[PDB]
Amino acid sequence: GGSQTVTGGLRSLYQRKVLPLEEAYRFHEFHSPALEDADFENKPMILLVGQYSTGKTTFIRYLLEQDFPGMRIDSFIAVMYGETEGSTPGNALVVDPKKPFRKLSRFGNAFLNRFMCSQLPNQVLKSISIIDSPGILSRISRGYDFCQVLQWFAERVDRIILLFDAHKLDISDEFSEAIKAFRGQDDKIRVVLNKADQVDTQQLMRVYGALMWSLGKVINTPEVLRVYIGSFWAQPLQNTDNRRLFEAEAQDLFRDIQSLPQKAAVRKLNDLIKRARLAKVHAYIISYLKKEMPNMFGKENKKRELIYRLPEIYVQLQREYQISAGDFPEVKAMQEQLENYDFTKFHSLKPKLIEAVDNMLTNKISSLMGLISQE
Template sequence: MSIRRFWSSPKTLGDVNVVTEELKNLYYKRLLPIEKHYSFHHFHSPSYEDADFDNKPMVLVMGQYSTGKTTFIRYLLEEEFPGSRVGPEPTTDCFTALMYGEEERVTPGNAITVDPKKPFRNLDPFGNSFLNRFQCVQMPNPVLERISIIDTPGILTAAKRKLSRGYDFQAVLRWFAERVDRIILLFDAHKLEFSDELTRAFGALYGYEDKLRVVLNKADRVDSQQLMRVYGALMWSLGKVFRTPEILRIYIGSFWSEPRQRCDHYNLIELEEEDLLTDIRNLPRNAAVRKLNDLVKRARLVRAHAHIVSHLKQEMPTIFCRESKKHNLIYELPVIFTKIQQQHRVPAGDFPDCTKMQEKLLGQDFSKFKTLKPSLMNSLNKLLTTDIASLVPLFQQQEQRKKSLPAVLDGEFLGTFRRDQFKGDPFKEMLKDDEVSEADSDEWAVEKYKPKYDEIFYNLSPHNGKLSGTKVKEWMTTTHLPNSVLAHIWRLADVDRDGMLDNEEFALAVHLIEGKLDGHWLPRELPSHLVPPSKRLSTSSDAPA
């Protein structure tokens, strides 16, 4: 049965679309007029567009150069993508948005920012220096049918911090951080270094720590004692940078498709990998909740901004000493923040960063600011108190149907999928030996390699001509390939889906493993020339019309 058939769920998808449309209507009706009235976009992010509400969940992958960002993405997609380069030096020199498309194509940054169907139109203010370093890659990858992935240039270390990018790297990161659903921050277990640019990049993530997932990559290349020290050093360094009492979750892994080195913490790496992949896999299910959370966060910032702007307008003189008064008000902005908190009961967490606000106010004409408009503020308060609350029943209905909502089911995410259609997957459940009918043998693409594969097969002591999932798993794990890769090989090899492998299916599995060890990508569906002869009639009769 095709995996894609589990992606179509019109009823539940309709629920998500209803929630998204309601959020879109609330933004255009309640929030956008206030943003325009108080020039919110001159100080903070541009206004939302339809594409910001309708786009698929996005994952931002960032980290220092040579930490495995591009390799991590290739690991998720299980294939190369145009423009991907890996190496010990800084190889990725641009932002790359990976999105789904029926045909593989690369669109330059200047062209993609004029497409109203893509959520990148507001990147235009960053100018040609950035847009020349931005591209959108579309490809028919099933993982990209449910999520989009943003690959980023490597953050420079201290030795290269004098190099200029030509655009505001921190501002671009913050633009993406505001709009993505998940931020994956990778560190190399071999070279843990916090450079100046990395510290500034952390500043771009301020306020979006809930989206952040930290990954300590290449953990199989160090022993357990070294891993413990590196993990502790990373926790200590992150605690100094992020101004939150909560501890960031750090995943330990080795995210590439090559065999892992056998180490004492091998099982820990497998468990951590599954946790992270499950977190990413569930992003489509939680997309509507994330959009609601971002809308509420933006509305609270708009409310604080309106009070700040109106207060500055009231304090400005009409004729004399306007410039000196302006500088005094900017200098006293922290005191003004406190006054607004007390007078209007605006929480301190809703206010923008004071230092950045002072910098932006220097170039503004205070005479153009507007005073508080009661009708607009009442509309904003209604949004936060009544309108959002009216959406709760829709979210509750969605929560009840969460198991039916589509998730990411391809690439490395197959290893975290636990549905009944993958019956007999030994990487998710242990099976007992059952009696099965013997299969006839015939020639196929694996035939010339089969004698050496049969020797391994019979050394594993098959029962009634078949090997159980337990025995096959024990042998397959000796290859040190990631469990998610081995799980995909199992599903390709177990053609009759009985949870066991006969000699032909086992030969097919070993053939796929050898191909993977030689650096080849696995097929998503088993090609006809690899289907064992005894299974060709059954697979063709089972195929959907």
């Protein structure tokens, strides 16, 4: 709801202020194409990795506080918002251009047959999407590369939740192999020690301790991971000795997840800023190239002189516009592309378009970050 206003504000600011400066200097043919409305309406995703019978399917029902189609308390499920409670098989989901699952077609039927999108109107899903994963075992035989599909979600997911069972902590080689496939994205990982009320207090310490022991043994990062310890479902507690703990841990978890759409808003706001800066540089470059072109003859001779002297051009522009060499595009990649452009057809500099962007960066953004601040 509130972050749908943020989404609208970003799209608006981009189309009114940034996009015209990209189109004026063919930004989209050099670097990246125009941003579609899909680039803005992204809800942060969560990947649930956990062995069989850990409680992932219940964990989802616990957050949503509601059932979802084809939940059945094994395959991949993408739980997302939807006007009506419905289910979409994977073979059809990977064709939907309004879904991030279009690239998943590379794994094929053996995977698609074990892939589904369950939709339902639920508050949680208005803000984020949950991707359940098949329960890892503790033999093997899947007609798709299970460790590569897991890897693929991890790179496009905002949060990864390793799920472990305090009643039966049995980290398997397959699970460990999956965790080693998530490395390089440890900041996305959190852990959940479920069914904590099933064991007595001493046993919880042995299990929880043996968990961290073997995790750090695997991830080999000085940055210890966060483990939310509790019993995550609607049922009563068995071993109430740590009731207060399990409740604070659940609140710490709800706060983590509830922050994801906010963190995403900022990430998008920063990406829009960086894009708007790159567009400025691109406009200053093309403009200078146009400025120097002769009024009539020696056009192809001047074009090649500019391309060869492009490194000097960069420094020329950095100084007379106080801009960083960091948001400049790579020198050689430009030169390779500037070969294919009639320099004389470029547009002279349009101060009207740059002012529109600089007025966005100085004034218009301070308010959005204020709209994000009001959680």
